[PDB]
Amino acid sequence: METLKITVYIVVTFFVLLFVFGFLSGDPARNPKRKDLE
Amino acid sequence: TTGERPFSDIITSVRYWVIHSITIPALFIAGWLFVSTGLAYDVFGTPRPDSYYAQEQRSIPLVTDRFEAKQQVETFLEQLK
Amino acid sequence: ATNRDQESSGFAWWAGNARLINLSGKLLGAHVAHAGLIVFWAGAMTLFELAHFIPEKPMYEQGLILIPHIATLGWGVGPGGEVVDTFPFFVVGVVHLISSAVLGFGGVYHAIRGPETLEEYSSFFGYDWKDKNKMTTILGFHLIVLGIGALLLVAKAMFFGGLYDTWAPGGGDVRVITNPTLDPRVIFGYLLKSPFGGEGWIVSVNNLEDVVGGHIWIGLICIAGGIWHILTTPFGWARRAFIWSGEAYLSYSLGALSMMGFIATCFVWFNNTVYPSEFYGPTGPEASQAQAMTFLIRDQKLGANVGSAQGPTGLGKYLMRSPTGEIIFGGETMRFWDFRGPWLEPLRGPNGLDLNKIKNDIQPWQERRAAEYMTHAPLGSLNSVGGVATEINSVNFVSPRSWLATSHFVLAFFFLVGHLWHAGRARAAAAGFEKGIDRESEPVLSMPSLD
Amino acid sequence: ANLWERFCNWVTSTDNRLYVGWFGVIMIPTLLAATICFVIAFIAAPPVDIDGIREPVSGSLLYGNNIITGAVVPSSNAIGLHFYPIWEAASLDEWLYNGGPYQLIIFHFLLGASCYMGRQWELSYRLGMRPWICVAYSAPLASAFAVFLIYPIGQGSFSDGMPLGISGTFNFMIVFQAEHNILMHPFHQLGVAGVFGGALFCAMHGSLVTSSLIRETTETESANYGYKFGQEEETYNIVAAHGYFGRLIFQYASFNNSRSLHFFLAAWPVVGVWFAALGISTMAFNLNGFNFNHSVIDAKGNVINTWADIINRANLGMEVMHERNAHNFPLDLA
Amino acid sequence: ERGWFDILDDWLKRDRFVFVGWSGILLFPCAYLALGGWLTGTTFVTSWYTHGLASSYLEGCNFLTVAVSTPANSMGHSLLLLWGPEAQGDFTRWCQLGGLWTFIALHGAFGLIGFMLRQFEIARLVGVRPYNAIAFSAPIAVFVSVFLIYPLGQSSWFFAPSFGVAAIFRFLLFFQGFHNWTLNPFHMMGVAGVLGGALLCAIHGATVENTLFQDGEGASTFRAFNPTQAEETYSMVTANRFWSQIFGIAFSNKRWLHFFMLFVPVTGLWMSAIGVVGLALNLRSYDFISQEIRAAEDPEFETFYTKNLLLNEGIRAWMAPQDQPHENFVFPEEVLPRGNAL
Amino acid sequence: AELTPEVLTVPLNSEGKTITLTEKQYLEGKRLFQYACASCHVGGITKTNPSLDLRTETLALATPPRDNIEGLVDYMKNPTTYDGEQEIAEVHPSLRSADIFPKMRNLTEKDLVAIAGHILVEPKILGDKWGGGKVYY
Ligand code: CLA
Ligand code: CLA
Ligand code: CLA
Ligand code: CLA
Ligand SMILES: CC1=C(/C=C/C(C)=C/C=C/C(C)=C/C=C/C=C(C)/C=C/C=C(C)/C=C/C2=C(C)CCCC2(C)C)C(C)(C)CCC1
Ligand SMILES: CC1=C(/C=C/C(C)=C/C=C/C(C)=C/C=C/C=C(C)/C=C/C=C(C)/C=C/C2=C(C)CCCC2(C)C)C(C)(C)CCC1
Ligand SMILES: CC1=C(/C=C/C(C)=C/C=C/C(C)=C/C=C/C=C(C)/C=C/C=C(C)/C=C/C2=C(C)CCCC2(C)C)C(C)(C)CCC1
Ligand SMILES: CCCCCCCCCCCCO[C@@H]1O[C@H](CO)[C@@H](O[C@H]2O[C@H](CO)[C@@H](O)[C@H](O)[C@H]2O)[C@H](O)[C@H]1O
Ligand SMILES: CCCCCCCS[C@@H]1O[C@H](CO)[C@@H](O)[C@H](O)[C@H]1O
Ligand SMILES: [Cl-]
Ligand SMILES: [Cl-]
Ligand SMILES: [Cl-]
Ligand SMILES: [Fe+2]
């Protein structure tokens, strides 16, 4: 159970970091019209 | 457009309100008196608050005979007084 | 009539307030007039409550939501939450009502008489939504204001007579807080607690020292943040993450208010410290616990050995164990064993409810309180018939906790919807397609087929 | 481009057969976990002590259920609102007895479905659409939140969350009626107007557009071949449809503006379902349906029943029989 | 050739604010009398002699509790005509016996026929296909199944739904407790058609509104549509890509889409009606025999199916004496099914 | 049926004397019972001890007898267990315990008589519903 907990913690942190860094990665500019929204 | 006078013309006209400032309150008052005079109870056969049960009765006057139902209701009504 | 039809503004009457987006003077008026409406209601509603208030009935039998907020600050009440003086309630109501006139005056003036834009009137008061530095400045001012408000609570609790403390030794009473909790391990510890059962995140705050200490931190954090935001401009990574427009900013605040609303719903539903049960009635968990307590007392008076009494299921009829072994009340209230309240805690030992305390130490005040709370559980109909859904008409009661939790759920929910509506629109407007797809430049038509 | 850049370009790509996106990065794993657990549990899970009274209820197919009776059973009343991940159990056997799969499934699902809503915004943005499909999806989503999270919170237990099953759903409905008189609550009434009206307007829109399709085919082919995907010209005559409907009722009761019509089609069911969801979410804190029990009294004080009192008798039946071994004290307070 | 029939036909079909037609001769009186009867009864008329209930504003009921209630069980399926053998021409007695119930149900039935005839008549005049009339067959099948067929299979009109908000709720709960109607796959198909229809309504409206072409300068986008325009107001191609990518499939054919919008809720309603026809005969989906065999033999075997039947048994025992007064049920406290404490 | 003077005539004492309450007294009694008592005693039951109800026959068998105005008025001043053996003012609303049950603070002697009359009159109207609980709803 301890190993499972840690594994899930690491899995969740991995995906959450992808979500946050991903939306921080110039998301307003990822559209088909006007990109210079900064 | 289907030929009739626009509603918005009608209800913003003075003549409409001359008429309806009478007829509307007349109808409302007549409905009021239909109840306040007790006429409504008589027309529809609805019990008044004192007429659901005889004084000591606690049995519903349920209709149990299809063809004598009118007479049963009448007997129930007699039992009140 | 500047920008006051659809043809000139681009917005229909039903979105008419969007005509204000770039008219800073008229928009100031709308905001100040609105603040007036809020303050008016606080004032008027208090006076209505006071007019309708019978001092010797519990507040919670009287449909009161505002008097309980004033009482919780220590005004007008004494031991047990008894009302000792209604004048503080009158003062709060009157001063709010008077103040609303002033806000209404300013609001109406800026809305229909003052300069419709502020920018050519004043560089200080005018603003462009897209000016990042000016937006953080105004944000900064408002943070300072909010921090001063949090420190007002601190000042009330420490220097101006205290707060109502349901936990006060020997019975609830107004108490001055002399040792607010400053330790950041405790204060920020609440913030990292699980929101699940037995933990309850910030809603678990259960003593006034932590509450006051919390506001000391918040007030200082907010004042510092305000100075920071006045003295800086947003960094590159923030510039790249956000949409910078009035509608975008609205969206972010709607999101925030939604979140706060759901939190407030949970606070009034579970918390009996900053929402004392003396004023708000028992919590749902509290009343269910109180029922078990009531019948334990009754049946034990009759000779029942309540520790050894096996219920129909094999679990203890009155007392059983929680999943970690603590002695708790039985029946369906097993779910509520995390409940804590001053009338019950004297019966609690290190391993939970203590059988010797139960057998020997239950005082008549505890019996009274449990009976009171069991019979004022937060259940009732929309037309304010108290009790279970099958109960007959007789008791006119809906708990203030039910009114407050339901209203704030509804409002938080629609605010989430507004967050989504305005955030999605802000995005589309910023990118230039909020009015629809350009027929001659339809993006999908330039993309490869999916298959 | 570096790896992170390339990865971001792929995640947000408008060319993936199924859009991934940042929402999708959370949605995909959480939905897969919820789905896989649900399927396995629905098939093979042992009985679960839903009511915390050591009275296990069998939900799975292998333990004597069919598709209609089967369910993944809510977590135990002993747990209440406590968080019961696999790793808080001493063993999977305990986890199973106590209804651990329920929590794993509903939490992964609610997270995943919230990200499904976000993903609808996200793709609309990538494709240059207007953004509010996600707002329409907030209606069913809010409803799932109400029955799986908000109601449990209010009542103090995930044991009172809607079961993941067909009969389980009906159990939740009947007990909800007993406890809240939901039928008499105006928010559930708005919900009914929302779905009956959504169905009515669905049929009405379908029938009126179908009525007015322009002749482009012969009698030995489907009229559907008269429309080609992506053609510029509208395929029905809205003027004829309005001509029809405006005479069916009267002129100003019919929409001649397609945008206004399609907005109404969105708004009617969405708003009604938002009120349905809010009904459940506010009955969660026991503000219940209208109670007119014994509201009509005669001159003496005899109770004169109305149809509300008959409802009340049905409700009482439900109340006294539900969870027949779980109550020890006279009032059902949660 | 130019005779009175043709002249009347002319008049009936004039293009006026409210279209009349030949169908109007049936529709207007029947609809007016059904609506007027409902308003009359809910406002003034009791259910004391038929049900032992107050049912009107006059007696103190509100919009939720008023009803025009069914006749006494002893009337059987009597047409209950004003001039019939029960009321014998006495309007007051007729009201007291529940004559307004058959009045409303029968004028309502003929009114619905008139409405569907109107849909046909108008379609024919304007030159459209009669799918709206076809779709309205669902409401007809529901009305006929629930208000006419159901009570006709039962003992009397007593057991039809009474026309009232709370009265209809009572009808739902009766069907749960006595028929286990939630368990019926025909009701389930109903549910799926109604909820599915609501889904399609929401999703189609939102999709059109979110794939609009920019056809004006306004931020409020309704004015950028002209009824007479040739072109689609929204992009089917963008809508199609969106849904293909979000959900995996998407509509590509607008005629199919709008046909499906007819089919789903219409088919659902029609299925629910078939189930109610079975309930007329108590031909229920009440039980799973395999479940009952197991549970009878094994006192540890419990499912949500068994739990619901216990609820049903409560409903029946607790509601029957007041809900079925003609049976004169007396159920001593000691026989009433109850769980612990409650 | 009407709320007659006969319905409103109830025993004053254990010795055969009666008192005929006015319609205003009946209404006051209902209001006051709702105000001070119905949170536990709605419909003539007792939510915190369902074994004891407010039925007239139950009150007759209480010690001292509580099936008359004097017995009920005395109960509201100095409540006892059903056998008369213990004084329960510390856990039951009474004038004697108005300090801890503050709703009792404003009740006058007139008010106690009205509440008492309500307890005696209501079963005359409602029959077994009075003290019957949910079974008779
Ligand atoms: C809290 C609610 C609120 C507030 C504060 C505002 C504020 C405003 N709206 Mg909005 N609006 C609202 C709700 C609100 N709105 C709602 C619900 C709708 C939909 C019906 C609208 C629809 C709408 C449209 C279509 C338009 C506005 C516009 C405006 C602005 C100009 C109004 C004007 O020219 O008045 C002219 C009216 C008068 C001169 C009549 C009197 C109005 C005053 C303020 C009444 C005050 C009474 C009060 C009791 C006085 C107390 C005084 C005392 C303290 C001394 C103003 C800033 C306009 C705008 O954007 O301009 C650029 C605009 O075109 N609004
Ligand atoms: C957020 C609220 C707010 C903001 C940003 C403004 C902004 C402005 N107002 Mg308005 N106004 C307001 C509220 C506001 N007003 C209210 C409530 C009223 C009713 C009394 C008015 C009545 C008003 C009039 C009649 C006029 C203005 C004018 C102005 C302009 C010049 C202000 C100035 O020079 O003061 C400079 C600074 C001072 C005079 C010192 C400040 C003194 C205040 C009282 C200190 C209070 C501080 C305290 C923290 C406030 C707590 C509030 C809280 C309890 C709610 C400026 C655009 C003028 C204008 O537009 O010219 C055409 C103008 O003639 N305002
Ligand atoms: C209403 C109050 C408020 C608002 C709207 C803002 C807004 C802003 N601040 Mg400020 N700030 C504030 C108060 C506020 N601040 C206070 C009180 C302080 C003092 C502590 C600061 C100190 C501060 C600093 C030091 C900086 C900012 C910066 C910023 C900018 C970027 C913020 C951002 O990316 O957030 C979003 C947050 C993140 C992207 C961080 C990671 C997200 C995690 C995972 C969120 C997890 C929480 C989750 C939802 C659960 C809630 C419960 C939780 C408490 C456990 C933006 C202009 C930045 C800037 O540009 O300054 C010029 C910056 O460097 N602010
Ligand atoms: C299209 C219009 C229309 C339709 C279809 C109906 C249909 C009905 N009405 Mg309604 N009604 C209407 C308009 C209509 N009504 C109007 C305008 C009024 C206000 C005056 C009423 C007032 C009314 C009342 C008060 C009642 C009815 C009732 C009825 C039902 C029984 C009718 C019956 O047995 O007729 C039998 C007659 C015919 C079918 C006519 C046939 C004509 C033939 C073809 C010609 C032969 C005539 C012959 C020469 C006569 C000689 C007899 C002589 C030997 C003595 C039926 C549902 C009853 C009901 O609902 O009970 C529950 C009832 O009590 N209706
Ligand atoms: C803009 C606009 C708007 C809005 C507005 C607003 C929102 C306003 C507000 C306003 C306000 C917000 C106002 C207020 C006022 C107040 C006042 C006027 C007060 C007074 C007071 C007094 C007089 C007092 C008295 C008393 C006392 C002192 C004590 C006790 C008793 C008594 C109470 C008597 C609208 C929507 C219309 C639209 C158009 C535009
Ligand atoms: C007073 C008090 C207290 C304390 C308090 C405190 C200390 C608080 C704090 C608070 C805090 C400290 C808070 C925080 C918050 C945060 C948040 C809420 C966040 C948000 C975020 C966001 C929203 C983001 C977004 C995004 C991302 C994710 C990335 C990408 C993009 C974007 C940017 C969009 C206590 C409890 C002790 C007691 C009672 C009283
Ligand atoms: C049966 C009968 C008959 C007939 C009758 C009739 C035809 C009647 C009619 C009646 C009517 C025709 C009535 C009416 C009434 C009405 C009412 C009673 C109304 C009410 C309303 C309301 C209450 C409303 C409300 C509202 C509004 C306004 C808006 C929105 C919101 C609400 C909904 C709140 C005859 C003689 C042949 C024969 C024998 C039997
Ligand atoms: C309470 C927590 C306290 C946290 C304090 C620190 C604040 C958080 C800072 C996050 C910094 C991330 O900064 C962000 O990183 C990503 C990842 O390379 C950058 O990189 C991105 O640049 C462009 C921007 O148009 C994208 O097209 C590209 O795909 C990507 O590489 C962003 O342009 C940068 O702004
Ligand atoms: C912003 C307006 C606030 C008005 C402040 C009123 C003081 S409040 C006052 O403070 C006293 C000590 O000085 C306490 O003894 C007393 O209990 C308290 O009510
Ligand atoms: Cl159950
Ligand atoms: Cl219990
Ligand atoms: Cl008894
Ligand atoms: Fe369409």
Q: Among candidates D92, D116, D126, D97, which has minimal Cα distance to D35?
A: D116
Give the span between the Cα atoms of D72 and E14, in whole angstroms.
62
Fill in the DSSP letter of residue C321.
E
Give the span between the Cα atoms of E212 and E194, in whole angstroms.
27
- Extract the tokens encoding D211: 């009525």
Annotated domain spans of chain D: 1-334
Q: Flag if E86 and B70 touch (Cβ within 8 Å).
A: yes
Encode C300-369 in three state secondary structure: HHCCCCCCCCECCCCCECCEEECCCCCEEECHHHHHHCCCCCCCCHHHEECCEECHHHHHHCCCHHHHHH
Is some CB atom of chain D closer than 8 A to the CB atom of B6? Answer: no
Q: What is the DSSP string of E216-252?
A: SS-SS-GGG--TT-SB-SB-HHHHHHHHHHHTS----
Q: Flag if B54 and F2 touch (Cβ within 8 Å).
A: no
Ramachandran angles phi, psi of C393, nearest 5° = -55, 140
Contact D82, D100 (CB under 8 A): no
Mutate to test the interface with C, among E220, E237, E241 (most CBs of C within 10 A): E220
Of D302, D319, D330, the CB nearest to F1: D302
- What are the C-alpha distances in Å from D239 to residues C291, D213, D244, E70? 67, 11, 9, 44
Q: Among candidates A37, E30, E181, which has minimal Cα distance to C430?
A: A37
Q: Among candidates C428, E160, D27, which has minimal Cα distance to A19?
A: D27
- How many structural domains does chain F have? 1
Ramachandran angles phi, psi of D287, nearest 5° = -95, 105
- Extract the tokens encoding D288: 């219940």
Give the span between the Cα atoms of E287 and E181, in whole angstroms.
11
Contact F18, F105 (CB under 8 A): no
Q: Whose CA is nearest to atom 17 of ligand 6?
A: C256
What is the distance in A from the centroid of ligand 9 to the CA of C215?
Answer: 19
Give the span between the Cα atoms of F91 and F94, in whole angstroms.
9
Q: Among candidates C265, C268, C292, C298, which has minimal Cα distance to C281?
A: C268
Query: CB-hemisphere CA count at 13 Å for E224?
Result: 21
Q: Flag if B53 and D298 touch (Cβ within 8 Å).
A: yes
Give the span between the Cα atoms of E295 and C222, in whole angstroms.
64
- Extract the tokens encoding C190: 């609440």
Give the span between the Cα atoms of C15 and D185, in whole angstroms.
31
Q: Which amino acid is at E64?
A: L
- Extract the tokens encoding B11: 């209800």
Contact D272, D199 (CB under 8 A): no
Q: Strand E163-164 and strand F9-11: pairing?
A: unpaired
Contact E79, E157 (CB under 8 A): no
Asked how this structure was determined, the answer is X-ray
Report the first-to-last Cα separation within chain D, whole angstroms: 58
Q: Flag if F34 and C396 touch (Cβ within 8 Å).
A: yes
Contact E278, E284 (CB under 8 A): yes
CB pairs under 8 A between C and E: 58
Dihedral over Cα of C424, C425, C427, C428: its sign? positive
Of C57, C390, C396, the CB nearest to F134: C390
Fill in the DSSP letter of residue E69.
P
Q: Among candidates F53, D64, C241, which has minimal Cα distance to E288?
A: D64
Ramachandran angles phi, psi of C433, nearest 5° = -125, 25
Contact E143, E63 (CB under 8 A): no
Give the span between the Cα atoms of D325 and D328, in whole angstroms.
8
Give the span between the Cα atoms of C318 and C328, in whole angstroms.
8
Give the span between the Cα atoms of C24 and D40, in whole angstroms.
59
Q: What is the CATH number of domain C282-377?
A: 1.10.10.670
Q: Which amino acid is at B11?
A: I
Fill in the DSSP letter of residue E144.
I
Q: Is the CB of C119 under 6 A from ligand 2?
A: no
Give the span between the Cα atoms of F126 and D297, in whole angstroms.
11
Q: Is the CB of D8 under 6 A from ligand 8?
A: yes
Ramachandran angles phi, psi of C173, nearest 5° = -170, 165
Cβ neighbours, 10 Å, residue C412: 20
Cβ neighbours, 10 Å, residue C418: 18
- Extract the tokens encoding C128: 């462009």
Ramachandran angles phi, psi of A2, nearest 5° = -65, -40
Biggest distance spanned by C-alpha atoms of chain E: 83
SS3 state at C256 = helix
Cβ neighbours, 10 Å, residue C257: 15
Is some CB atom of chain E closer than 8 A to the CB atom of C314? Answer: no
D136: Cβ contacts below 8 Å, ≥ 6 apart? D266, D270, E202, E203, E205, E206
Q: State the residue range of the domain holding B65.
A: 1-81
Give the span between the Cα atoms of C207 and C157, in whole angstroms.
13
CATH of the domain at B60: 1.20.5.860
Contact E133, E56 (CB under 8 A): no
CA C112 to chain centre: 34
Exposed e or buried b per residue across C7-41, where buried means at least 16 C-beta atoms within 10 angstroms of its C-beta: eebbbbeeeeebbbbebbbbbbbebbbebbeebbe
**Closest-lying ligand 7 atom to the alpha carbon of residue E41:** 1
**Closest-lying ligand 9 atom to the alpha carbon of residue C156:** 8
Contact F136, F123 (CB under 8 A): no
Contact E337, E314 (CB under 8 A): yes
**Closest-lying ligand 5 atom to the alpha carbon of residue C40:** 12
Biggest distance spanned by C-alpha atoms of chain B: 66
Give the span between the Cα atoms of D80 and D11, in whole angstroms.
39
CATH of the domain at F72: 1.10.760.10
Give the span between the Cα atoms of E154 and E277, in whole angstroms.
11
Give the span between the Cα atoms of E194 and D192, in whole angstroms.
10
Is some CB atom of chain A closer than 8 A to the CB atom of D130? Answer: no
SS3 state at F12 = coil
Contact E315, E173 (CB under 8 A): yes
List residues bridging with C381 in a β-sheet.
Answer: D288
